[model samples]
Target: GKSPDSPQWRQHQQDVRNLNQYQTRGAFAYISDQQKVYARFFWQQTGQDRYRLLLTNPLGSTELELNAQPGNVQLVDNKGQRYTADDAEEMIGKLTGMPIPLNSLRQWILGLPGDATDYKLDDQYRLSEITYSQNGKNWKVVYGGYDTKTQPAMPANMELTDGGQRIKLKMDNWIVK
Candidate 1:
């Protein structure tokens, strides 16, 4: 297991810090290898290095809840199974079979460029498309309409794909407070 002081952990901490300014709630579809799952999510930054995410099915049944702090991470699934690991990304990937970039997503959902090396912005300077590589796989993100009513206006819809896996997100609301 990697220590909390490892470089990757530090980077994750920095990513969390960079995204601590806002809260987001939305519905999402996770598709991988022909399998698909739909859920609604609520994410909030509780502190500089602390955050929480709640994911539920459309029927409002909790699917998963994640709580993370500087040196600790915890996840509870609908089946009441609990998991913990030093690396939240790896833990989530192990459980879900999809290697989602949780840290980069915090930035991506906010209309900001995350670690993507190539990207394009629309006339409004909002992200239109972005492509990057993670875990040896290439990924692409295409943003749809923007919700002008939200503070710092965010993308209302987005589709992300990596050939074999695709995830679609539709943000129903943005809460700044």
Candidate 2:
């Protein structure tokens, strides 16, 4: 006996909002043609703080750690090579954080594209799409349809831009703590 007009749905919406409002901190597993890895990332109100991104390859042979604070950012490779930043902007300014439009690093690992600020929830209370730019090119990301009363942390499928770079997510099966 659950309905959109019921208190359950209202609470569900509030729950999603609360989770999204926090400075999200989590990890994700990524599999791409270029690299397959498990990366830990963190995000703040302004976007990314930098202390959050940590990437480790599937073989566990390489690691890339990115640490970002108010005025400092440090990147270190498994080989012991390190890079540091003098400012927060300098740390999150590059594509190294997460290239997917609004995802920060979370959506990237899930194979979706987006960040916290780049998207808006639709009447369905789900991320309908996100828009962004890179290298003078504009891109749009579309999310799949879902019937849940609450907002899921991620989407099941995403399509990128006019050229059609499609990303299919197996979140139901691959989501790991």
Candidate 3:
């Protein structure tokens, strides 16, 4: 009964769309054949093109801080060295050997489809899966849980995989404005 035709479904969609800006703290584990890395991730997204990503270790020590805005994109490592890249994801990927799809994730992680055509909504009127592609490679995102207490709800836990690489995110907090 909670189909697209239902009013709740529309409201839920609106909520997800309105959630363009938010601050989320979560833990992520990146697994691949070469290496496996785990860290606590924090993101503050102010708009479609602005956000700050912070990665910290289990001891709560700062690992790296990546800030993006317009043409200025910088990633500062623990050594206090600032680096710039045409792609923030590539910078982090190279540093950790994990495919961190920060671009599309700014949408998909919020249960909003940023790009790609293939997507499906779950019974709760949230995006259940999305296909995020970059270059010629395709990554599959699967939403396993949602935080229902949030106004528009939000992804609680999700997994993204491409061949041997797997990234799992478990959100610990969601702050919406």
Candidate 4:
């Protein structure tokens, strides 16, 4: 076994620590008014202002990996292509052809409104709808069903619309560890 203080061991520890925090793995679909992409994702909030999201094809092939920290965001595609940008949201939009609220999504998907100025909740206190402004554009999120099986009960379906583009997400499963 490697020494605990070794770089490899330290990285493994970090990975485990990150995985244990606000982790969710499931199948998801990103749909726009013009196009649709389906993939599975593993999302983890590594810290207060850091996150790692791994997106893969339905067949379990890696598609993209997004790592976001306080002042930087890095995205890598399966083809070994990598991109970094100060504004992750814009860069993701350019890559995927749809604007995704990556910054607030970690909170939004967990039923937190983040910094939304306007929002609404279901009778069960779950987030049903929310409106927020980002990058000089208004965005809306509509949550569909809730899965009660999970400890915190998360939305299984969601739709996000900005301007004329819309992205719909359908989560087939939710695993929290």
Error of 4 at 68 (Å): 0.9
lDDT of each: 0.72, 0.45, 0.79, 0.71
TM-score rank order:
3, 1, 4, 2
lDDT of 3 at 50: 82
Predicted structure 3: lDDT: 0.79
lDDT by residue (tens digit), candidate 2, 8-66: 54554454434422233344544345444455434333222323445555565436665
Error of 4 at 127 (Å): 1.2
lDDT by residue (tens digit), candidate 1, 52-134: 77889878788888887665789887676998877767767787666666667766776666577577766555668888888
Better of 1 and 4 by lDDT: 1
lDDT by residue (tens digit), candidate 4, 1-177: 223335653443343334435666776666666777777788777544678888898777778888888778898866768999877677777876656788788677766676785777665656688889876778889998977776556667888887677766666656655
Candidate 3 C-alpha lDDT tens digits along 34-143: 98878899988886778898889899887788997766678888666788877777777776456678777877777777776777778767778878668867899999
Q: Could you say which candidate leads in lDDT?
A: 3
Candidate 4 positional error at 24, Å: 1.9
Lowest-lDDT window of 10 residues in candidate 3?
1-10
Total clashes in model 3, counting residue pairs 3 or more apart in sequence or in different chains: 0
Model 4 spans > 4 angstroms off: 1-20, 175-177
Q: Could you give me the TM-score of model 4 versus the true structure?
A: 0.76
For each candidate in turn, the TM-score is 0.80, 0.45, 0.87, 0.76
Candidate 2 Cα errors over 4 Å, as ranges? 1-17, 20-51, 86-123, 144-152, 155-177
